[PDB]
Every structure is written in C-alpha cells, then in structure tokens.
C-alpha cells in the first residue's frame, strides 16, 4: 500500500527534465516506503534525527563547495597521495576486513583493494571505458592532510556550523572521518550497518539508498562477527536464498534517491544498501562519521540496537574465551539445541 | 562390547548370597561401562580422583559409625529438628529450585517439599506401607547442629583424616555440606550435574549410580539455567523423546551399584542419575560436598567442564542484560539462525 518507494523522480530546476527515472533502479523482492525529504529548518527533520530515524536534508549546504567537484577538478587539486581503489567483476562491492581474513582461510575475496595515485584511477577508469570492459572500480579513500590546497579550501567551506551543532544537540562523540567515495554507475554497496552515526553528503550523480531499521536484524542475517564480512548481510539481494534466510521474505525497507546537495542521515545500526543509478554516470559522495552518544546510566524495554550490541559482545567474548573464533558457532548450537529452540 | 554395566553382583561375606540382582535395576536405552571399584590405598584410585574421573572406594571407613544407622536408631537420636521431605506419585524425583519458580509461571511442580519431625516421616512412611499405597517419599535434609548427641558422636567418628587429606591433595575449597538422604526402594533422582566435588557415602541399602562425563552435555539437554530444573536433564530416561533430544541416542554412561561402606567419587560437572534398587528396601546415604579448586591463571584446548561453565555464564549474563530471563532463548535463536547453524 504505502510502499511508494523513492516516489516520483524530482524535476530539476530550469525545466531540465527528470533527474532520473525508475528504469535506472534495480529490482528487488521487498517493498519499501519513502524516506522523508525535508528542510534542515523543518522541525520534523530535527525530530527524526533526535529519534534516530533516517531523513534526507535538502538545504544544508553541508558540502556546497564540493558541488563543483568532478574528475578533472579533483585530478588537479586532490594531491599525489595514495587512494584506496576496489575492483569487481560484478556490480556488487562486498567489503572485507583484512585483519579478520586470518580467522577464515576458506574465504575467497571478491573485491581487491589497490592503492594508487588519483590520476591512475582516472586513467584506469577512462581505460576501462575505452575497451567497453565489464570490470568495475570504486574509489573509497579517507580524506587526509595530504590533499591539495584547493581541496583544503573547499573542505573549509563545508557548513561546519550546521554539522558541529548537530553533533552538539545529539550528544554525539567525535567526527572519526570523512570518506570520499567516487564510483561507477551501477555500482552497489550491499546492505550493511555501522556502529557510528552517518551524514551521507551527495555531490555528483544520483544514488539510491535502501535502509532497514535495527529491528530487522532477524531478516538480514549478518555474517559472524569474526568473519571478514562482519556487519554485512549474507543475503544476496539479487538472488536471495529463502531456504537459508527465510525471514528475508519479511524484510521491509525505507528508500530514497539522493542527488547533488542532499544529505542523508543514516542512523547508527541502520542497515543501508547503496547503489549508483544505472547509466547515471559516475557518482561522488563524501560522508561524515561520528561516534554515537555515550551509553546511559539502562531502561527497559531495551531498544533494538541495544540487543544488537549485546549479540555482538556475546560473539566477541566467546571468541576470546574459547581461544578460537571458529568454536563460537558449535558452542552456540550446543547451548540452544533442544534447550532454547 | 565393554558395556559390562555394574558387573556381576558382589557376594556378601559369610556366604549370605548376592547382595542384589539385575532384576532390581531399571531398564534404559543406553549402554554403560563399569565404574572402577578400588581400595583407597590403591594408587589408581588416587589417579582417578586427581584426574577428576569417578571411582568407588571400598575401604575408606568414611562413615563407619553410620553403618549401624537405621530408621529406629535415627528416630531416637537425630533430634527434634525439621527435616525436608519430598513426595511423588511417580518413582522419579525431579528437583525444583524454588527461588527460580518465579521466572516460569507455566511450571507445575511434581514433587513438593514438606518439613516435619523425623518421627513423622518414619510414621508417614510406615503409614504409606500400611495401605500399600503408591505414593513415594524421599527425605533429604542437611545435617545441622540440632542433631542428637549420639548422631553427633557418630559424626565425629567419620574418617576426617582421610577426607580432609583428600580435600588437601586436590586443592579443593571448603566442605559446604553433608546431606543425609533416606529414600524408599525404587526411588529415582534423575540425571543432573553439580558445580561441586562430591563424595557419596552409602550406608544402608543399595543404590545404582549412572554417571555421564561433562563432554556429554550435547546428549543430555539440561533445562535453561533460569529454569527451576537448572542442571537437570530434560530427557525422561524412561520414555526418551528422540525427536526433541536426538543426541540422547549417542549417550554412553558409567555405572556401578554402591552399598553399605562404599564411597563414590562423583566429580564436579559429571552428570549422575541415582536410583535405589527395586524391592531393595529403604536406602540411606550421606554425601560430602566441597567447592572445587580455584580457576588457574587458562590453557587450550579447553576442558569440557570449562565450556559448560562458559555456557552457564552466557545464559546468566544475557538474563541480566535483557532484564528478563524469558528473552534469553529468543535472543540466542536470533543470534544463530542463518548465521551459525
């Protein structure tokens, strides 16, 4: 019923037509309701953020100076630093935590990282578009102090007054980082959740963001905490295995398409699946990660994200206690078989 | 093959015949090997105890002064204190921890406790034998300072030099208690395990003791820790539900029949099912519970009882964390479904 989805595409100012159309969105087996698109001055948006519910802010001017960013401009002022760059034979970019790749030997990586100079990525990209290849690239690099003076100028022009104040009103911890993300159309970052508050600032291109609340942990089936893909869903949204993951048939998402100038508040613990529209061109995004507020001095009923916190801790403790993360599953099963199930 | 069981019944001194015969033992679906019966001076027995494996000591003189105990003698020197007495319409005496009876409302007790004077129990017993009723009684009362002078004399005559030294050589903690157990023939105390070291001193009658090592946790299915029957098996040995408890088909026990003068070492965490032989007459036993040695400063591989310790703690912590022990199961299932199973 109320599964509108992203809603009717927005009309770009100056009768320039629809910014995008449904045919650029991929097809999924689950329904979704729309994420509210509001003005930062709108009281509702502040209520949504405080209550940790997603919202799309349209007029923050958060990264106004970056709206002009494009491959050329960047490959001219970003510097000569090294930029992490992932690759993939498919559109899906599953992330792997390398420090955990030891716990699992029978794990075969699908997207390899590769440091390089911006001009190399831009070239490798152009080269990829040359022979009309199928390979896909996704540059994801934290912004360090090694960036050109211009980029630094642009950075200073971000609306710090607005975000810092947001950080203040929510009691959040410190900004841990700003990841710069440049990706090819069709690219997909599979559903996953974070332990930090996220302000996702779109700059170039359009991105479809599908979010699931913490209480859908049961339908999303995250990998084991000690596994490299910790925090990611094991469910393949394109070919879901309902035998292994029955409750994915019950998953209900919240979606929206963000474009140049939109800022999406992705609350801590909320799953998010993000895809760059098909034939939409490269996309550029800069996000802002903040440690969440501290843990209260607790109150029941417990919130969904708190139970997720508990489960993660249990898995961690058992891994240390048993001296081997591989024993976690067999111990958990022994504990519940014929006792709690 | 080597499933001898208790072995051929022992021959009582003075050609008084077999102390008991197989027909007094109940029938079970699992095999068992015999628990070794040795002399306290036998080095092997000391090795078994140190390695925490069960053993039957035949000549400790642990409770020599009590070998003369019988209903009359006791109902003449035990005192006027109160003695806990359980009842049951069946031969099975499942135990219920009352402090936990609040966590589960949908729990209907099967054996009710009832304080009374020794002479009342002896009378109630005689009365029960009068009308040839079916009710069964099992007196289980800790020995306090309110016992007659004679019983106190007898108590002092126990071989403290032997047991105290055992306590010394094993690094055990302190003797927590001595439970006096008087029961009717056919009575059964269902399989369960303890967190303390146990010296089970038989005094009158014969008892069949079936033990299972800690590593059979998977086949015995203990109730949830917060449940009243914590530490007991949910499996009904007389009519085992293989659908709910599949690995009970894999259970392998160690058994033996103890009689007047035998002392059975039931190591901490070892499951024990204890039954008074059918038509064997009332039985009397006094046990000795000691806190185990302290926890080392750990080493892998981990021992079976250590994993049991871990699982109990996990269940306890989650019960507190969630603020309701009833949420433990649903949380554990959410954690493993489609992730660790």
């Amino acid at each position: 019923a109320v599964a509108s989805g992203s809603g009717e595409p927005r009309e770009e100012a100056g009768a320039l037509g629809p910014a995008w159309d449904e045919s650029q969105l991929r097809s999924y087996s689950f329904p979704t309701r729309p994420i509210p698109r509001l003005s930062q001055s709108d009281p509702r948006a502040e209520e949504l953020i405080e209550n940790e519910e997603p919202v799309v802010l349209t007029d923050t001017n958060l990264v106004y100076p970056a709206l002009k960013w494009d491959l050329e401009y960047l490959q001219e002022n970003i510097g000569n630093g090294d930029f992490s760059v992932y690759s993939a034979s498919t559109h899906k970019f599953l992330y792997y935590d390398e420090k955990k790749m030891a716990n699992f030997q029978n794990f075969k990586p699908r997207s390899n990282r590769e440091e390089m100079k911006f001009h190399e990525f831009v070239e490798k990209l152009q080269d990829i578009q040359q022979r009309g290849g199928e390979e896909r690239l996704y540059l994801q690099q934290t912004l360090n102090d090694t960036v050109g003076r211009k980029i630094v100028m642009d950075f200073l022009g971000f609306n710090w007054n607005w975000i810092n104040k947001q950080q203040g009103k929510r009691g959040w911890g410190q900004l841990t980082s700003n990841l710069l993300l440049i990706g090819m159309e069709g690219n997909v970052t599979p559903a996953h959740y974070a332990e930090q508050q996220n302000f996702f600032a779109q700059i170039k291109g359009y991105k479809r963001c599908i979010l699931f609340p913490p209480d859908q942990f049961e339908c999303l089936y995250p990998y084991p905490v000690h596994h490299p893909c910790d925090r990611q869903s094991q469910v393949d949204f394109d070919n879901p295995d309902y035998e292994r993951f029955p409750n994915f048939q019950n998953v209900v998402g919240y979606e929206t398409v963000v474009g140049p100038g939109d800022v999406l508040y992705i609350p801590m613990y909320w799953w998010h699946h993000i895809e760059s529209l098909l034939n939409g061109g490269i996309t550029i995004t800069v996000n802002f990660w903040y440690k969440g507020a501290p843990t209260p001095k607790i109150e029941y009923p417990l919130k969904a994200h708190q139970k997720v916190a508990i489960m993660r801790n249990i898995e961690k403790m058992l891994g240390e206690a048993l001296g081997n993360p591989q024993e976690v599953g067999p111990l958990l099963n022994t504990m519940i078989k014929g006792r709690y199930n | 093959a080597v499933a001898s069981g208790s072995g051929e019944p022992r021959e009582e001194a003075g050609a008084l015949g077999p102390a008991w015969d197989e027909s007094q033992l109940r029938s079970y679906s699992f095999p068992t090997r015999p628990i070794p019966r040795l002399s306290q001076s036998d080095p092997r027995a000391e090795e078994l105890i140190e390695n925490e494996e069960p053993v039957v000591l035949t000549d400790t003189n642990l409770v020599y002064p009590a070998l003369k105990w019988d209903l009359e003698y006791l109902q003449e020197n035990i005192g006027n204190g109160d003695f806990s007495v359980y009842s049951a319409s069946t031969h099975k005496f499942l135990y219920y921890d009352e402090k936990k009876m609040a966590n589960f409302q949908n729990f209907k007790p099967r054996s009710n406790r009832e304080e009374m004077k020794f002479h009342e129990f002896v009378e109630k017993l005689q009365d029960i034998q009068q009308r040839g009723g079916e009710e069964r009684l099992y007196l289980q009362q800790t020995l306090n300072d309110t016992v007659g002078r004679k019983i106190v004399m007898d108590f002092l005559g126990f071989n403290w030099n032997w047991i105290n030294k055992q306590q010394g050589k094993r690094g055990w903690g302190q003797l927590t208690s001595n439970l006096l157990l008087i029961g009717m023939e056919g009575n059964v105390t269902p399989a369960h395990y303890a967190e303390q070291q146990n010296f089970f001193a038989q005094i009158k009658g014969y008892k069949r003791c079936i033990l299972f090592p800690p590593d059979q946790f998977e086949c015995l299915y203990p109730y949830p820790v917060h449940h009243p029957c914590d530490r007991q098996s949910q499996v009904d040995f007389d009519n085992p539900d293989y659908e709910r408890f599949p690995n009970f088909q894999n259970v392998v026990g160690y058994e033996t029949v103890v009689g007047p003068g035998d002392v059975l070492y039931i190591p901490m965490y070892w499951w024990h099912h204890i039954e008074s032989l059918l038509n064997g007459g009332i039985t009397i036993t006094v046990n000795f519970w000691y806190k185990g040695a302290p926890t080392p400063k750990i080493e892998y591989p981990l021992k079976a009882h250590q994993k049991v310790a871990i699982m109990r703690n996990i269940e306890k912590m989650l019960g507190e964390a969630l603020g309701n022990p009833q949420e433990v199961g649903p949380l554990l299932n959410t954690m493993i479904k489609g992730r660790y199973n």
């Binding site: 332990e195 969440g292 843990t295 607790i298 417990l302 708190q306 916190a309 508990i310 993660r312 801790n313 249990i314 | 912590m317 964390a321």
Partner: peptide, 6 residues
C-alpha cells in the same frame, strides 16, 4: 554493561 558498542 554488555549493552555497549565499539
């Protein structure tokens, strides 16, 4: 606690 992240 146990209800804490990281």
């Amino acid at each position: 606690q146990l209800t804490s992240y990281d």
